[PDB]
DNA sequence: AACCGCCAAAC
DNA sequence: GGTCACCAATCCTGTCCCTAGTGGCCCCACTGTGGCGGT
C-alpha cells in the first residue's frame, strides 16, 4: 500500500522490480504521503535507462540528472505531449498531434472515460519515453490520486524539503515550479485531421458529422491492470 | 560478380511423397502401418560407466545390469505377404534458367546468359543422367535398397513405360546391360527436356516392388523429436493419412529429394563418394565439409567468379572435344537444388 | 585410440519377427492366438506378510488366505494339433568392416585396417560358427526350446536347404553327429561370406517344427508395461497382425537377436555360461557385470588399446597356428552387434 | 545538411 | 382387416502383487516491414 512497505526487501533486484512494477500504469497506485524524498529519488532515477541504473535508490546520479538543466528541460518539454486520448493507437503514423479534453457525458448503460477521474498518458517520440516517466507517473498523495506536475503546481511547500534534501537551490526550484505550472497540459485539440486518423459519417441534425474515434488512456490502463490480475 | 540483397532460385525437381503399401487379392492398395512396441534396452553408453577423464564412476554393482524402458514404433511386413511396394511421383520444371528474385539487373542478365550458354553445350544432359541413375539403382529406398530382389517401374506423362527387372545387378560405377543403358538413355532425354523447356509439362510415376522376406523390417522416414515425454514414443515414423482413416508409413519429400541429388563427386579428381548437393559439400559420415569456405570449391566462391566461367563455356562449343569444368557442373546442381544465395547491403 | 564425438556402427545381423502358427489339411498358415483369462493369485510374497526387519505385519488371520484377481493372456495349442511352427527370416550385411560414422580420420583408417587383418586371420569364421550354432540348437525358442522333438529347417538365398532332425540330440558343448557337423560347416561358410563381402546379398528362412503335447503352453515375447490399468491384462504378448484381422502370437526381433548373439564366454578362461554380447557383459540372472568398468575386459578399455591389438593380429599371417586373443573376438562381436560408441569432445 | 541514431519489455 | 398379452423378479462373500529401470551426440535460419529532432 505505502512506498517503503516494498522497500523492506533486502534484495535490491526484487525491490527495484516491485518499485518499477508499482509506478507503472498497469498496476495499483502506492501511497507516498509518508515518503516524499525517497519517492523523488526513484521517480527521477526512473528517467534513466534500465541498463544505465544498477539500483534506483542511488542518490548521486539522481542529483547528476537534477543538477543538469539539459535533463529536466527534456522532462518539461515532454509535459506538452500529455494526452487524455491516444491519437497514435494503433497507427503511429499520426504525426505530431495531442488530444487533451475533459471526460464526456456519463451514460448509465455504456462504459467510457466519464466513469473515472481525468488521468493522463504520454505519446510523442520513443527517444524521450524515459524522460516522461518523471512527470506522468501517477502516485497516491494524502488520500488523493496525483502526479508530480499537479502536486508541484499548487502544493509546493510540502515538496520544498523533499527537493532541497539533495541540495537543489530555492531560486532554481521556484523557477522550475512556475515553468512547470505554466507548462501544465492545456485543452489541446488538433487544428487539422491527420491523413492516418480514421473518420466515419454519423447522422447529425439534418445531415452527417465526421467522427474520429480515439481510445481513452484511463479505460485502457484499467483493462490492462484488470488483465494482469487475471480477472476475466 | 556481387551477391544481391535478394537472390532466390525455385527448385527444378519435385518428388511428391514415397508411401509403403502391399497388395492382396481383394485390394491393390493396403497401407503398411506402424505400431508402438515397448522393449527392454541395456545401459551400454560411455557416460553410464565412465567420467569425461576416462575414470570409472561410483555406481552400485547392479546398476549396469538395470535396463532402460524404450517406447519405439516398429514396421514389419505382415506374415505371408510376398511383395512390398514403395511409390512416389516426380515433377521436373525449368527453374534454373532464371532466378525467382534478383535485386541487381546486371546480376540477373548475367545468370540468364550463363544458363543459355550451359544449355547449348549440353550441360543439362550430364546432370539429367546422374538424377536418372539414382532413380534406376534405387538410392531413394535408403535402407530398404537391395534388401530383396527389387523391380522399379517408371510411367512418364509422355506415355513411356520403363522397367528395371533387378536393382541388385545395377550399381553407380558397374558395367550395365544393353537394355538397362537404353532405359537410362531415353529417360535422361525426357528429364533434360523438362529441365530446359518451360513450355514442356513433365511428370513420372515411380514404383519399386521388393521381394519381401518373412516379417521383414521396413525403414521409413523418422520425425525429428529433440524433446520426448515418457508416455509417447522416442522413435516415431513419418505417416501418409489415407482417405478412409489409416496411416501408411512414408518417406519425406526432402528425403527422396536428398537421394536423387546425391550426384556430387567433383569435389576431388579421384573422389569415390557421391555427396548430397550442398553449398559447402557437407559429409555427414566423416563429419567434414569437402568444399570448405577457405577453399575455392564452395558454391559462393564459384558463384562470384561466374564471369570467368561464362568465358570458358563460350570456347566449349567451338571445339566440343574438351569437357566442361566440373566447377560449372557443381554450380548448376545447386541452382537445380534451389535456395537463397543472398549477402546483404553493407 | 581416442574416442571421437561421432563413432557409429550398423548391426550386421537382421532377424525379423518370429511368428508361432500351425497347419491344417485346408490351410498352410493358421496363426496361434492368445486369449485373456482371469485366475486367482494367492498372497505368496515376502512383503504380503513381513516388515523389512523380518517381523510379522499386524493384519487379519484370514486375509493371507485371500486371492488377488490376475488378468493374464495365455497361448495354448488347440486340441489334437500335432505340430506347432515358429519361423523368422535372417538377413546378414557386412557393416563391421567400416564405421557408419567417424569424426576422426586416423580412427577410421585404424578400424578399417583392423577389420581387414582380422578377416585374413580367419576371425569372422569363428564368430560365424557361434551365431550358426545358436540357430541349429534352437536357443531362439527361449522357453519353448526342447519342450518336444524339434526339427529346424533352413533355406538360404544361395539355394541351399539344411535340416536338423532333432535339437534334443544337440547342445553347445556335446559331440555332434557327422551329418549335423556338415550342416554347421556349410551354413557357417555362407554367414562368414555375408559378414565380410559387401557385394553379396545373403538371406535365410529358418523354421522350427515342434512335436506339441496335448494343449501345451506357448511362451512368446511379453510387452514391457509398467502403466497397466485395473481392467487391462498385467501379462500381454507381442502379436504379428495377419492380412486378415487375426493376431499371431510372436517373438520380438531384438529377442531373436539376443539369442543368436549369446556367444560371449571369453570374460573368464574357464567360463561355462555364454552372455548376450554387452559392452560391460551384463548378467541379470546373477545381477553383476562380468566385464566391469574397473577391469580391462569391458569394450571401451579394449577399444582404447586397438593399436596394441592390431600389432598382435599382424603375427597371424606368417604363423597361423597361434589362436586369436579372446579380447579381439569379443571386440568384433560388439561391432557386429553395432552401437553408438562416442564420447563428448573433451 | 540529409542521413545515422535513440528508444521498450508484459505472462 | 389388422396387430405384435399382462402380473413381479436382477444375489450374498473375499481379494487385484512383489523386483528393477525409462540412454548418450548434435542442432533449432537467413529478408524486408520507424517517427522524430539535429548536427
PDB file of C-alpha atoms in Angstrom, chain B residues 73-247:
ATOM      1  CA  UNK B  73       7.495 -47.522 -33.396  1.00  0.00           C
ATOM      2  CA  UNK B  74       8.038 -50.793 -35.395  1.00  0.00           C
ATOM      3  CA  UNK B  75       7.038 -51.543 -39.055  1.00  0.00           C
ATOM      4  CA  UNK B  76       7.213 -55.232 -40.209  1.00  0.00           C
ATOM      5  CA  UNK B  77       5.715 -56.854 -43.373  1.00  0.00           C
ATOM      6  CA  UNK B  78       2.599 -58.917 -42.381  1.00  0.00           C
ATOM      7  CA  UNK B  79       3.191 -62.741 -42.463  1.00  0.00           C
ATOM      8  CA  UNK B  80       2.975 -64.452 -45.947  1.00  0.00           C
ATOM      9  CA  UNK B  81       2.977 -61.090 -47.886  1.00  0.00           C
ATOM     10  CA  UNK B  82       5.253 -61.741 -50.944  1.00  0.00           C
ATOM     11  CA  UNK B  83       5.910 -58.156 -52.257  1.00  0.00           C
ATOM     12  CA  UNK B  84       6.094 -54.638 -50.657  1.00  0.00           C
ATOM     13  CA  UNK B  85       5.551 -51.514 -52.872  1.00  0.00           C
ATOM     14  CA  UNK B  86       7.134 -48.020 -52.429  1.00  0.00           C
ATOM     15  CA  UNK B  87       5.557 -45.410 -54.822  1.00  0.00           C
ATOM     16  CA  UNK B  88       6.226 -41.637 -55.373  1.00  0.00           C
ATOM     17  CA  UNK B  89       5.516 -39.105 -58.207  1.00  0.00           C
ATOM     18  CA  UNK B  90       8.268 -36.784 -59.639  1.00  0.00           C
ATOM     19  CA  UNK B  91       7.569 -33.444 -61.479  1.00  0.00           C
ATOM     20  CA  UNK B  92      10.507 -31.616 -63.245  1.00  0.00           C
ATOM     21  CA  UNK B  93      10.298 -27.821 -64.034  1.00  0.00           C
ATOM     22  CA  UNK B  94      12.761 -25.395 -65.776  1.00  0.00           C
ATOM     23  CA  UNK B  95      13.533 -23.073 -62.769  1.00  0.00           C
ATOM     24  CA  UNK B  96      17.423 -22.964 -63.064  1.00  0.00           C
ATOM     25  CA  UNK B  97      17.319 -20.774 -66.277  1.00  0.00           C
ATOM     26  CA  UNK B  98      16.058 -17.565 -64.489  1.00  0.00           C
ATOM     27  CA  UNK B  99      16.360 -16.504 -60.787  1.00  0.00           C
ATOM     28  CA  UNK B 100      12.944 -16.245 -58.968  1.00  0.00           C
ATOM     29  CA  UNK B 101      14.159 -12.998 -57.263  1.00  0.00           C
ATOM     30  CA  UNK B 102      17.154 -10.692 -58.092  1.00  0.00           C
ATOM     31  CA  UNK B 103      17.848  -7.082 -56.835  1.00  0.00           C
ATOM     32  CA  UNK B 104      20.663  -6.237 -59.379  1.00  0.00           C
ATOM     33  CA  UNK B 105      19.591  -6.344 -63.097  1.00  0.00           C
ATOM     34  CA  UNK B 106      23.316  -6.765 -64.140  1.00  0.00           C
ATOM     35  CA  UNK B 107      23.486  -9.977 -61.952  1.00  0.00           C
ATOM     36  CA  UNK B 108      20.062 -11.157 -63.367  1.00  0.00           C
ATOM     37  CA  UNK B 109      21.090 -10.690 -67.082  1.00  0.00           C
ATOM     38  CA  UNK B 110      24.493 -12.448 -66.426  1.00  0.00           C
ATOM     39  CA  UNK B 111      22.844 -15.544 -64.759  1.00  0.00           C
ATOM     40  CA  UNK B 112      20.265 -15.689 -67.661  1.00  0.00           C
ATOM     41  CA  UNK B 113      23.171 -15.687 -70.243  1.00  0.00           C
ATOM     42  CA  UNK B 114      25.170 -18.365 -68.252  1.00  0.00           C
ATOM     43  CA  UNK B 115      22.166 -20.820 -68.236  1.00  0.00           C
ATOM     44  CA  UNK B 116      21.572 -20.394 -72.053  1.00  0.00           C
ATOM     45  CA  UNK B 117      25.347 -20.980 -72.789  1.00  0.00           C
ATOM     46  CA  UNK B 118      25.318 -24.085 -70.453  1.00  0.00           C
ATOM     47  CA  UNK B 119      22.124 -25.320 -72.285  1.00  0.00           C
ATOM     48  CA  UNK B 120      23.727 -25.190 -75.825  1.00  0.00           C
ATOM     49  CA  UNK B 121      26.930 -27.001 -74.539  1.00  0.00           C
ATOM     50  CA  UNK B 122      24.694 -29.979 -73.474  1.00  0.00           C
ATOM     51  CA  UNK B 123      25.431 -29.431 -69.736  1.00  0.00           C
ATOM     52  CA  UNK B 124      21.847 -30.341 -68.601  1.00  0.00           C
ATOM     53  CA  UNK B 125      22.290 -33.802 -70.315  1.00  0.00           C
ATOM     54  CA  UNK B 126      25.137 -34.836 -67.887  1.00  0.00           C
ATOM     55  CA  UNK B 127      23.142 -33.559 -64.807  1.00  0.00           C
ATOM     56  CA  UNK B 128      19.918 -35.361 -66.008  1.00  0.00           C
ATOM     57  CA  UNK B 129      21.872 -38.711 -66.372  1.00  0.00           C
ATOM     58  CA  UNK B 130      23.035 -38.534 -62.673  1.00  0.00           C
ATOM     59  CA  UNK B 131      19.462 -37.695 -61.400  1.00  0.00           C
ATOM     60  CA  UNK B 132      18.051 -40.548 -63.617  1.00  0.00           C
ATOM     61  CA  UNK B 133      20.789 -43.071 -62.500  1.00  0.00           C
ATOM     62  CA  UNK B 134      19.790 -42.508 -58.781  1.00  0.00           C
ATOM     63  CA  UNK B 135      16.128 -43.486 -59.687  1.00  0.00           C
ATOM     64  CA  UNK B 136      17.116 -46.739 -61.558  1.00  0.00           C
ATOM     65  CA  UNK B 137      19.523 -48.179 -58.844  1.00  0.00           C
ATOM     66  CA  UNK B 138      17.008 -47.262 -56.041  1.00  0.00           C
ATOM     67  CA  UNK B 139      19.123 -44.796 -53.932  1.00  0.00           C
ATOM     68  CA  UNK B 140      15.734 -43.345 -52.693  1.00  0.00           C
ATOM     69  CA  UNK B 141      14.898 -46.629 -50.773  1.00  0.00           C
ATOM     70  CA  UNK B 142      17.839 -45.638 -48.455  1.00  0.00           C
ATOM     71  CA  UNK B 143      17.942 -48.662 -46.009  1.00  0.00           C
ATOM     72  CA  UNK B 144      15.302 -50.820 -47.884  1.00  0.00           C
ATOM     73  CA  UNK B 145      17.600 -50.754 -51.025  1.00  0.00           C
ATOM     74  CA  UNK B 146      18.655 -54.302 -52.187  1.00  0.00           C
ATOM     75  CA  UNK B 147      17.080 -55.980 -49.056  1.00  0.00           C
ATOM     76  CA  UNK B 148      15.209 -58.143 -51.642  1.00  0.00           C
ATOM     77  CA  UNK B 149      15.089 -58.518 -55.479  1.00  0.00           C
ATOM     78  CA  UNK B 150      13.662 -55.024 -56.367  1.00  0.00           C
ATOM     79  CA  UNK B 151      11.817 -54.244 -59.683  1.00  0.00           C
ATOM     80  CA  UNK B 152      11.500 -50.450 -60.480  1.00  0.00           C
ATOM     81  CA  UNK B 153       8.621 -49.464 -62.886  1.00  0.00           C
ATOM     82  CA  UNK B 154       8.513 -45.829 -64.263  1.00  0.00           C
ATOM     83  CA  UNK B 155       5.451 -44.321 -66.120  1.00  0.00           C
ATOM     84  CA  UNK B 156       6.100 -40.807 -67.640  1.00  0.00           C
ATOM     85  CA  UNK B 157       3.356 -38.306 -68.765  1.00  0.00           C
ATOM     86  CA  UNK B 158       4.645 -38.668 -72.419  1.00  0.00           C
ATOM     87  CA  UNK B 159       3.224 -42.275 -72.320  1.00  0.00           C
ATOM     88  CA  UNK B 160       6.625 -44.104 -71.962  1.00  0.00           C
ATOM     89  CA  UNK B 161       6.889 -47.197 -69.643  1.00  0.00           C
ATOM     90  CA  UNK B 162      10.391 -48.181 -68.297  1.00  0.00           C
ATOM     91  CA  UNK B 163      11.213 -51.358 -66.254  1.00  0.00           C
ATOM     92  CA  UNK B 164      14.365 -52.333 -64.246  1.00  0.00           C
ATOM     93  CA  UNK B 165      13.984 -56.135 -63.597  1.00  0.00           C
ATOM     94  CA  UNK B 166      16.531 -56.275 -60.666  1.00  0.00           C
ATOM     95  CA  UNK B 167      18.353 -53.298 -58.953  1.00  0.00           C
ATOM     96  CA  UNK B 168      20.879 -55.730 -57.267  1.00  0.00           C
ATOM     97  CA  UNK B 169      22.556 -56.224 -60.735  1.00  0.00           C
ATOM     98  CA  UNK B 170      22.917 -52.388 -61.219  1.00  0.00           C
ATOM     99  CA  UNK B 171      25.297 -50.028 -59.300  1.00  0.00           C
ATOM    100  CA  UNK B 172      26.653 -46.447 -59.934  1.00  0.00           C
ATOM    101  CA  UNK B 173      30.126 -47.470 -61.319  1.00  0.00           C
ATOM    102  CA  UNK B 174      29.345 -51.078 -62.574  1.00  0.00           C
ATOM    103  CA  UNK B 175      29.039 -52.034 -66.316  1.00  0.00           C
ATOM    104  CA  UNK B 176      25.265 -52.189 -67.192  1.00  0.00           C
ATOM    105  CA  UNK B 177      23.411 -54.439 -69.725  1.00  0.00           C
ATOM    106  CA  UNK B 178      22.313 -53.164 -73.219  1.00  0.00           C
ATOM    107  CA  UNK B 179      18.565 -52.903 -72.242  1.00  0.00           C
ATOM    108  CA  UNK B 180      19.313 -51.085 -68.884  1.00  0.00           C
ATOM    109  CA  UNK B 181      21.517 -48.420 -70.663  1.00  0.00           C
ATOM    110  CA  UNK B 182      18.646 -47.897 -73.225  1.00  0.00           C
ATOM    111  CA  UNK B 183      16.284 -47.079 -70.241  1.00  0.00           C
ATOM    112  CA  UNK B 184      18.966 -44.667 -68.797  1.00  0.00           C
ATOM    113  CA  UNK B 185      19.456 -43.028 -72.287  1.00  0.00           C
ATOM    114  CA  UNK B 186      15.704 -42.498 -73.101  1.00  0.00           C
ATOM    115  CA  UNK B 187      14.559 -41.334 -69.575  1.00  0.00           C
ATOM    116  CA  UNK B 188      17.563 -38.878 -69.267  1.00  0.00           C
ATOM    117  CA  UNK B 189      16.410 -37.193 -72.571  1.00  0.00           C
ATOM    118  CA  UNK B 190      12.857 -36.690 -71.084  1.00  0.00           C
ATOM    119  CA  UNK B 191      14.294 -35.110 -67.823  1.00  0.00           C
ATOM    120  CA  UNK B 192      16.749 -32.848 -69.819  1.00  0.00           C
ATOM    121  CA  UNK B 193      13.758 -31.531 -71.921  1.00  0.00           C
ATOM    122  CA  UNK B 194      11.760 -30.826 -68.674  1.00  0.00           C
ATOM    123  CA  UNK B 195      14.842 -29.102 -67.049  1.00  0.00           C
ATOM    124  CA  UNK B 196      15.360 -26.786 -70.129  1.00  0.00           C
ATOM    125  CA  UNK B 197      11.895 -26.168 -71.808  1.00  0.00           C
ATOM    126  CA  UNK B 198       9.443 -24.002 -69.740  1.00  0.00           C
ATOM    127  CA  UNK B 199       6.597 -24.931 -72.227  1.00  0.00           C
ATOM    128  CA  UNK B 200       7.056 -28.734 -71.519  1.00  0.00           C
ATOM    129  CA  UNK B 201       4.946 -30.173 -68.609  1.00  0.00           C
ATOM    130  CA  UNK B 202       6.588 -33.493 -67.493  1.00  0.00           C
ATOM    131  CA  UNK B 203       5.795 -35.881 -64.555  1.00  0.00           C
ATOM    132  CA  UNK B 204       6.792 -39.537 -63.767  1.00  0.00           C
ATOM    133  CA  UNK B 205       5.080 -42.197 -61.542  1.00  0.00           C
ATOM    134  CA  UNK B 206       7.935 -44.306 -59.976  1.00  0.00           C
ATOM    135  CA  UNK B 207       7.105 -47.628 -58.149  1.00  0.00           C
ATOM    136  CA  UNK B 208       9.583 -50.105 -56.527  1.00  0.00           C
ATOM    137  CA  UNK B 209       8.446 -53.774 -55.977  1.00  0.00           C
ATOM    138  CA  UNK B 210      10.688 -55.573 -53.373  1.00  0.00           C
ATOM    139  CA  UNK B 211      10.583 -59.414 -52.844  1.00  0.00           C
ATOM    140  CA  UNK B 212       9.921 -59.320 -49.035  1.00  0.00           C
ATOM    141  CA  UNK B 213      11.486 -61.844 -46.577  1.00  0.00           C
ATOM    142  CA  UNK B 214       9.170 -63.299 -43.834  1.00  0.00           C
ATOM    143  CA  UNK B 215       8.075 -60.480 -41.399  1.00  0.00           C
ATOM    144  CA  UNK B 216      10.883 -58.188 -42.741  1.00  0.00           C
ATOM    145  CA  UNK B 217      11.575 -54.782 -41.030  1.00  0.00           C
ATOM    146  CA  UNK B 218      10.708 -51.609 -43.094  1.00  0.00           C
ATOM    147  CA  UNK B 219      12.895 -48.439 -42.620  1.00  0.00           C
ATOM    148  CA  UNK B 220      10.779 -45.315 -43.418  1.00  0.00           C
ATOM    149  CA  UNK B 221      11.464 -41.599 -42.532  1.00  0.00           C
ATOM    150  CA  UNK B 222      11.724 -40.816 -38.752  1.00  0.00           C
ATOM    151  CA  UNK B 223      10.363 -37.429 -37.424  1.00  0.00           C
ATOM    152  CA  UNK B 224      12.808 -35.042 -35.600  1.00  0.00           C
ATOM    153  CA  UNK B 225      11.783 -35.106 -31.869  1.00  0.00           C
ATOM    154  CA  UNK B 226      14.537 -33.271 -29.848  1.00  0.00           C
ATOM    155  CA  UNK B 227      12.415 -33.465 -26.599  1.00  0.00           C
ATOM    156  CA  UNK B 228      10.170 -36.532 -25.812  1.00  0.00           C
ATOM    157  CA  UNK B 229       7.776 -37.344 -22.885  1.00  0.00           C
ATOM    158  CA  UNK B 230       7.871 -40.753 -21.082  1.00  0.00           C
ATOM    159  CA  UNK B 231       4.408 -41.796 -22.456  1.00  0.00           C
ATOM    160  CA  UNK B 232       4.975 -41.015 -26.192  1.00  0.00           C
ATOM    161  CA  UNK B 233       7.492 -42.967 -28.386  1.00  0.00           C
ATOM    162  CA  UNK B 234      11.190 -41.830 -28.636  1.00  0.00           C
ATOM    163  CA  UNK B 235      11.302 -43.213 -32.261  1.00  0.00           C
ATOM    164  CA  UNK B 236       8.272 -42.140 -34.436  1.00  0.00           C
ATOM    165  CA  UNK B 237       7.734 -42.570 -38.252  1.00  0.00           C
ATOM    166  CA  UNK B 238       6.517 -40.128 -40.988  1.00  0.00           C
ATOM    167  CA  UNK B 239       2.950 -41.241 -41.997  1.00  0.00           C
ATOM    168  CA  UNK B 240       0.643 -40.531 -45.001  1.00  0.00           C
ATOM    169  CA  UNK B 241      -3.032 -40.439 -43.782  1.00  0.00           C
ATOM    170  CA  UNK B 242      -5.154 -42.458 -46.320  1.00  0.00           C
ATOM    171  CA  UNK B 243      -8.677 -41.355 -47.478  1.00  0.00           C
ATOM    172  CA  UNK B 244     -10.521 -43.945 -45.237  1.00  0.00           C
ATOM    173  CA  UNK B 245      -8.732 -43.333 -41.863  1.00  0.00           C
ATOM    174  CA  UNK B 246      -5.462 -45.411 -41.962  1.00  0.00           C
ATOM    175  CA  UNK B 247      -1.789 -44.208 -41.754  1.00  0.00           C
TER     176      UNK B 247
END
